């Protein structure tokens, strides 16, 4: 959906193109008038007819001055308009995409499409090129014909400085990281790179100039410019930028043959920047392009992956700054609503279902204790990942990451259909089951299991009539590799008072008969 701010920008660029094209027509007229004055001056050098020719030359030069004064001020007004539209395009519209990329990297909505920004940047770049050529023409014209108080002599140096500054800054802004450094075997976990593992990245120049095809050599490196680990990028660290049919004519450079090796604070919290460099030589201008990736965590073993991903989650959730390498020296605090958004993204990016309101509320209570409104609550790096949970030998994130993995690899189909209540407190599960008939059950995750465990809580009535709520010992990942959770639910039997094996499970919460819900999976 196109915004009001974006539609106003589309018209502002079209108005710039119209102004640029109007000045081109004025440039033609001023050149023809000067060419006529130059010709008539150099020629014809009854004797009072020479006095009439002199009056014609004076009138032509005064008309030349007025046309020059007009063009100069028309160009000054065009540059001011270009400056405003560029600030909206680069400092606002481009920055939003950069933030949208940070969010998409975590597991947020993938709205990071460059096609609209490439079209806007190219349009502004083509208009600025014609303007730079018009200012070059004024220099050419002045050399041939000039006079005391010439508007070109006094205002062209400023006009030239302004367009050159505009074009350089637009070229520098257009050099972006389209696809952040990521390991192909871990696509859902970018910005985490293990040493010795082949990794890919992609860069794009949003100024769609066919002149630049096969002309830009992109150099990639790591740790350019206390006691921090230094690394080197090995493999093919130079790529020539080219226009592809696959990119739809876009200038890009994809690096697929990269690896990190240590050169000759905690590892999961140490951040590094992967830098891209090139030089553009366009019609007399040397523009030095330099862009960098979002901070990367460099790991040595794949066991470090969970804690490394949490550092990326914290960074991209809390800051919009793309180069804060010292972020974890004093990490910022997050709100519950900020954290809850990220936690639901961990599930919606890997599965067809994110986290529900009830699941997020029980997750809020696990970290902050009892309450009703968690919107005014705060979660620190220590409560999330750095330190172990209260009364437990593992952190909240490690416990949660093992659940995400359990869902993704062992109980995906059940999670995707909504048969997993997942996160429900001991008090709340007893409450919602108390009303329901005997044999009603819900599926949830273990809180004491570090590696991840799945359980089912059911309700029944004793001889006395008192309602009893019990859970089964959590089924481990090893057990889920032999039998599916669905087969375990159906096959579960208990020893009755009559000493007969019976299934204590009849309806899945709220009233779904077990065979209707789990029969299709066994």
Ligand X SMILES: CC(=O)N1CC[C@H]2CC[C@@H](C(=O)N[C@@H](CCC(N)=O)C(=O)NC(c3ccccc3)c3ccccc3)N2C(=O)[C@@H](NC(=O)c2cc3cc(C(F)(F)P(=O)(O)O)ccc3[nH]2)C1
* Residue number with CB closer to ligand X (209 or 410): 410
Spatial CA neighbour of 209 closest among 239, 238, 232, 241: 241
Cα-to-chain-centroid distance, residue 369? 33
Q: Judged by CB under 6 A, how many residues of this single chain contact ligand X?
A: 16
Q: Could you tell me the two tokens for 304?
A: 């470090």
* Residue number with CB closer to ligand X (397 or 456): 456
* Residue number with CB closer to ligand X (33 or 472): 472
User: Least distance from C-beta 464 to ligand X, angstroms?
Assistant: 16
| Beta-ladder partners of 222 | 274
* Residue number with CB closer to ligand X (422 or 474): 474
* Residue number with CB closer to ligand X (123 or 455): 455
Q: How far apart are CA 33 and CA 41, in angstroms?
A: 12
With beta carbons less than 8 A apart as the criterion, state whether 385 and 314 touch.
yes
User: Least distance from C-beta 476 to ligand X, angstroms?
Assistant: 7
Q: Could you tell me the two tokens for 401?
A: 């990451």
| Beta-ladder partners of 454 | 445, 475
Q: How far apart are CA 454 and CA 443, in angstroms?
A: 7
Which residues, 6+ apart, have CB-to-CB distance to 400 below 8 Å? 343, 346
Long-range contacts at 151-156 (CB < 8 A, ≥ 24 apart): 151/65, 151/68, 151/69, 151/72, 152/68, 152/72, 155/72, 155/76, 156/72
Q: How far apart are CA 14 and CA 254, in angstroms?
A: 32
User: Least distance from C-beta 463 to ligand X, angstroms?
Assistant: 15
Among 493, 502, 512, 520, binds ligand X (CB under 6 A): 493
Using only C-alpha atoms, the chain has a radius of gyration, in whole angstroms, of 34
User: Least distance from C-beta 453 to ligand X, angstroms?
Assistant: 6
User: Least distance from C-beta 359 to ligand X, angstroms?
Assistant: 15
User: Least distance from C-beta 444 to ligand X, angstroms?
Assistant: 7
User: Least distance from C-beta 112 to ligand X, angstroms?
Assistant: 38
* Residue number with CB closer to ligand X (127 or 449): 449
Q: How far apart are CA 196 and CA 30, in angstroms?
A: 64
* Residue number with CB closer to ligand X (358 or 447): 447
User: Least distance from C-beta 364 to ligand X, angstroms?
Assistant: 17
Name which of residues 417 to 476 contact ligand X (CB under 6 A): 446-449, 455, 470-475
With beta carbons less than 8 A apart as the criterion, state whether 360 and 373 touch.
no
Q: Looking at 41-49, 188-196, 335-343, 491-499, which segment touches ligand X (CB under 6 A)? A: 491-499
User: Least distance from C-beta 251 to ligand X, angstroms?
Assistant: 54
With beta carbons less than 8 A apart as the criterion, state whether 239 and 220 touch.
yes
With beta carbons less than 8 A apart as the criterion, state whether 379 and 400 touch.
no
Name the CA dihedral angle for 272, 274, 280, 285, rounded to a multiple of 10 degrees: 0
CA distances from 183 to 106, 191, 236, 240 (A): 15, 8, 16, 22
Q: Does the footprint of ligand X cover residue 74 (CB under 6 A)?
A: no
| Beta-ladder partners of 286 | 281
User: Helices then strands (H, E): number in the chain?
Assistant: 15, 20
* Residue number with CB closer to ligand X (315 or 410): 410
> Phi/psi of residue 467, each to 5°?
-70, 125
* Residue number with CB closer to ligand X (492 or 521): 492
User: Least distance from C-beta 485 to ligand X, angstroms?
Assistant: 11
* Residue number with CB closer to ligand X (1 or 500): 500
- Residues in contact with ligand X by CB under 6 A are 446-449, 455, 470-475, 479, 492-495
């Amino acid at each position: 959906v196109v915004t009001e701010k974006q539609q106003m920008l589309e018209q502002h660029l079209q108005d710039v193109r119209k102004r640029v094209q109007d000045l081109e027509q004025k440039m033609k007229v001023v050149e023809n008038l000067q060419d006529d004055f130059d010709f008539n001056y150099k020629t014809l050098k009854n004797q009072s007819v020479t006095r009439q020719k002199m009056q014609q030359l004076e009138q032509m030069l005064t008309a030349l001055d007025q046309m020059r004064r007009s063009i100069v001020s028309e160009l000054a007004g065009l540059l001011s308009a270009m400056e405003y539209v560029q600030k909206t395009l680069t400092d606002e519209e481009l920055a939003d995409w950069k933030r949208r990329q940070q969010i998409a990297c975590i597991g947020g909505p993938p709205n990071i499409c460059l096609d609209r920004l490439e079209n806007w940047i190219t349009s502004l770049a083509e208009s600025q090129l014609q303007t730079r050529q018009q200012i070059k023409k004024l220099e050419e014209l002045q050399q041939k014909v000039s006079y005391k108080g010439d508007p070109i002599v006094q205002h062209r140096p400023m006009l030239e400085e302004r367009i050159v500054e505009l074009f350089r800054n637009l070229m520098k802004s257009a050099f972006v990281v389209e696809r952040q450094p990521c390991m192909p075997m871990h696509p859902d976990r970018p910005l985490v790179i293990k040493t010795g593992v082949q990794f890919t990245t992609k860069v794009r120049l949003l100024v769609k100039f066919p002149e630049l095809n096969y002309q830009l050599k992109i150099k990639v490196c790591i740790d350019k410019d206390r006691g921090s680990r230094k690394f080197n990028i090995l493999g093919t660290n130079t790529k020539v930028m080219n226009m592809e049919e696959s990119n739809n004519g876009s200038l890009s450079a994809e690096f697929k043959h990269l690896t990190l090796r240590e050169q000759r604070l905690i590892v999961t919290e140490e951040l590094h920047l992967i830098t891209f460099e090139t030089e553009v030589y366009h019609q007399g201008l040397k523009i030095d392009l330099e862009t960098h990736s979002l901070p990367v965590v460099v790991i040595s073993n794949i066991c470090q992956m969970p804690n490394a991903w949490a550092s990326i989650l914290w960074y991209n959730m809390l800051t919009n700054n793309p180069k804060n390498v010292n972020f974890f020296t004093k990490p910022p605090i997050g709100t519950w609503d900020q954290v809850a958004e990220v936690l639901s993204w961990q599930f919606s990016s890997t599965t067809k279902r994110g986290l529900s309101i009830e699941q997020l509320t029980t997750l809020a209570e696990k970290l902050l204790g009892p309450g009703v409104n968690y919107s005014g609550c705060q979660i620190t790096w220590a409560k999330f990942c750095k330190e172990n949970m209260a009364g437990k030998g593992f952190s909240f994130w490690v416990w949660l990451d093992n659940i995400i993995d359990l869902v993704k690899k062992y109980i995906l189909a059940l999670w995707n259909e909504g048969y997993i209540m997942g996160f429900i407190s001991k008090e709340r599960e007893r409450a919602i089951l108390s009303t329901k008939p005997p044999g009603t059950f819900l599926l949830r995750f273990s809180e004491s299991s570090k590696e991840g465990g799945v359980t089912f809580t059911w309700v029944e009535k004793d001889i006395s009539g008192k309602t009893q709520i019990q859970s089964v010992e959590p089924y481990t990942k090893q057990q889920l590799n032999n039998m599916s959770f669905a087969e375990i639910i159906m096959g579960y039997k208990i020893m009755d008072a009559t000493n007969i094996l019976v299934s204590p499970l009849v309806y899945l919460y709220p009233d779904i008969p077990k065979e209707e819900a789990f029969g299709k999976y066994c």
